[PDB]
PDB file of C-alpha atoms in Angstrom:
ATOM      1  CA  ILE A   1     131.858 183.870 129.926  1.00  0.00           C
ATOM      2  CA  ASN A   2     133.668 180.812 129.054  1.00  0.00           C
ATOM      3  CA  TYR A   3     135.276 179.047 126.228  1.00  0.00           C
ATOM      4  CA  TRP A   4     134.615 175.251 127.446  1.00  0.00           C
ATOM      5  CA  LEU A   5     131.160 175.576 128.335  1.00  0.00           C
ATOM      6  CA  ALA A   6     130.718 177.211 124.839  1.00  0.00           C
ATOM      7  CA  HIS A   7     132.849 175.595 122.441  1.00  0.00           C
ATOM      8  CA  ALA A   8     132.585 172.243 123.920  1.00  0.00           C
ATOM      9  CA  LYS A   9     129.120 172.357 123.849  1.00  0.00           C
ATOM     10  CA  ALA A  10     128.664 173.883 120.515  1.00  0.00           C
ATOM     11  CA  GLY A  11     131.548 172.088 118.988  1.00  0.00           C
ATOM     12  CA  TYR A  12     130.267 168.985 120.591  1.00  0.00           C
ATOM     13  CA  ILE A  13     128.823 167.981 117.072  1.00  0.00           C
ATOM     14  CA  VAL A  14     132.093 165.930 116.417  1.00  0.00           C
ATOM     15  CA  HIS A  15     130.787 163.061 118.248  1.00  0.00           C
ATOM     16  CA  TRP A  16     126.981 163.851 118.079  1.00  0.00           C
ATOM     17  CA  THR A  17     126.459 164.677 114.341  1.00  0.00           C
ATOM     18  CA  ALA A  18     127.652 166.758 111.571  1.00  0.00           C
TER      19      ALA A  18
END
């Protein structure tokens, strides 16, 4: 379980791409 190691990973497209 984790919210940072899930959202900060999948939601890491803010600096990656989108």
